[PDB]
Design an enzyme around this catalytic site. Structure first.
Site, short mmCIF file in Angstrom:
data_model
loop_
_atom_site.label_atom_id
_atom_site.label_comp_id
_atom_site.label_asym_id
_atom_site.label_seq_id
_atom_site.Cartn_x
_atom_site.Cartn_y
_atom_site.Cartn_z
CG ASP A 112 -2.12 0.99 1.08
OD1 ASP A 112 -2.46 1.39 -0.06
OD2 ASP A 112 -2.69 1.35 2.13
CD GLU A 142 -3.23 8.70 -0.40
OE1 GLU A 142 -4.23 7.96 -0.25
OE2 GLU A 142 -2.40 8.58 -1.34
N1 LIG Z 1 3.05 9.83 12.53
C1 LIG Z 1 2.32 10.75 11.83
N2 LIG Z 1 2.69 12.05 11.79
C2 LIG Z 1 1.99 12.97 11.09
N3 LIG Z 1 0.88 12.68 10.38
C3 LIG Z 1 0.39 11.41 10.34
C4 LIG Z 1 1.11 10.35 11.07
N4 LIG Z 1 0.42 9.20 10.86
C5 LIG Z 1 -0.63 9.50 10.07
N5 LIG Z 1 -0.65 10.82 9.76
C6 LIG Z 1 -1.66 11.50 8.92
O1 LIG Z 1 -2.92 10.84 9.09
C7 LIG Z 1 -3.32 10.14 7.89
C8 LIG Z 1 -3.93 8.75 8.17
O2 LIG Z 1 -2.96 7.90 8.78
P1 LIG Z 1 -2.84 6.33 8.39
O3 LIG Z 1 -2.00 5.75 9.49
O4 LIG Z 1 -2.30 6.26 6.98
O5 LIG Z 1 -4.37 5.90 8.44
P2 LIG Z 1 -5.16 4.76 7.59
O6 LIG Z 1 -4.61 3.45 8.09
O7 LIG Z 1 -6.60 4.98 7.99
O8 LIG Z 1 -4.82 5.09 6.15
C9 LIG Z 1 -2.05 10.08 7.04
O9 LIG Z 1 -2.35 10.09 5.64
C10 LIG Z 1 -1.31 11.35 7.44
O10 LIG Z 1 -1.91 12.47 6.78
MG LIG Z 2 -3.11 5.39 5.21
#
Ligand SMILES: Nc1ncnc2c1ncn2[C@@H]1O[C@H](COP(=O)(O)OP(=O)(O)O)[C@@H](O)[C@H]1O
Ligand SMILES: [Mg+2]
Ligand SMILES: CC1=NC(=O)N[C@H](c2ccc(F)cc2F)C1C(=O)N(C)C
Ligand SMILES: [Cl-]
Ligand SMILES: [Cl-]
Ligand SMILES: [Cl-]
Ligand SMILES: [Cl-]
Ligand SMILES: [Mg+2]
Length: 265
Positions: free
Chosen positions: A130, A134
């Protein structure tokens, strides 16, 4: 051990399908981190408990500068909380919306950092599956970090779970539901290299149905400004037959990468 009371919560960092991610500070230490919140009802309704488990297991054991750390987790009656390394410069997704396209040196540097991290992963036969903007985060020195290990697994592999949103980064064998391995991440690397230079992914279309067609037929073309060397690297990665895709070592030593990247292997 950990509970919600141990933390002060701050601004929303981002939203996922399940993840709602906040800035937070641990009270006793003042350690700043990111808190990824998930609703147990949503996880259960979608039936993705096994993905969450894999995310925690895989990403807590990995240690690499271009891979985001996961420190721990807890849960209460309604929610699960993942305790993550905070990435202060945000997502590659955002940076691309800001600048429209990246230049060759920015692109090749990001691809090297990616290839380094994926090489570490594939050495343990972990495939991510994946890889997309994002899910690519940026550190305090602007270094790329791979995150969101929810879809990751050990190879070889079938797919047991329903595909969610965009097909844009997935190779033919995974969308056709066939068996797959490490080379899926190599395909995705090619898709990214193209999107970084052009501003949009190579198989983008108006409908799911049409995108599926363009991916399975590998139908992409280049704008005039894409150079000979980038065309060579991208065309090698986007091969229908996974066994024809290059090794990560060949990517890191590709002439266009070495001439343009500002970081080593
Ligand atoms: N450690 C982090 N620091 C800053 N932003 C984050 C972090 N983790 C996630 N994000 C933000 O939150 C969004 C969703 O996180 P993610 O873990 O990818 O969720 P999902 O599993 O629902 O896709 C990411 O696309 C990013 O924009
Ligand atoms: Mg994600
Ligand atoms: C050790 C655990 N025991 C639990 O009883 N529930 C948790 C759980 C696991 C899967 C899931 F989809 C949702 C959950 F809340 C749990 C866990 O490993 N977490 C990663 C939070
Ligand atoms: Cl600590
Ligand atoms: Cl399987
Ligand atoms: Cl699966
Ligand atoms: Cl290799
Ligand atoms: Mg996820």
């Amino acid at each position: 051990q950990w509970a919600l009371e141990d933390f002060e919560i701050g601004r929303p960092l981002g939203k996922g399908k399940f993840g709602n991610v906040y800035l937070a500070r641990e009270k006793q230490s003042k350690f700043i981190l990111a808190l990824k919140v998930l609703f147990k009802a949503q996880l259960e309704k979608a039936g993705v408990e096994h993905q969450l488990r894999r995310e925690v297991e895989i990403q807590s054991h990995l240690r690499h500068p271009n891979i985001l750390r996961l420190y721990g987790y807890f849960h209460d009656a309604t929610r699960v909380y993942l305790i993550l390394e905070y990435a202060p410069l945000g997502t590659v997704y955002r940076e691309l919306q800001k600048l429209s396209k990246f230049d060759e040196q920015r692109t090749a540097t990001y691809i090297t950092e990616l290839a380094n991290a994926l090489s570490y992963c594939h050495s343990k036969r972990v495939i991510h599956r994946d890889i997309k903007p994002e899910n690519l985060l940026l550190g305090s020195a602007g270094e790329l970090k791979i995150a969101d290990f929810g879809w990751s697994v050990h190879a070889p592999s079938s797919r047991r779970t329903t595909l969610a949103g965009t097909l844009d980064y997935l190779p033919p064998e995974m969308i056709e539901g066939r068996m797959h391995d490490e080379k899926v991440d190599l395909w995705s690397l090619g898709v990214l290299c193209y999107e970084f230079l052009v501003g949009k992914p190579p198989f983008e279309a108006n409908t799911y149905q049409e995108t599926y067609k363009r991916i399975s037929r590998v139908e992409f073309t280049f704008p005039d400004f894409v150079t000979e060397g980038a065309r060579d690297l991208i065309s090698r990665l986007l091969k229908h037959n996974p066994s024809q895709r290059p090794m990560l070592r060949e990517v890191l030593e590709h002439p266009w990468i070495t001439a343009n990247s500002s970081k080593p292997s």
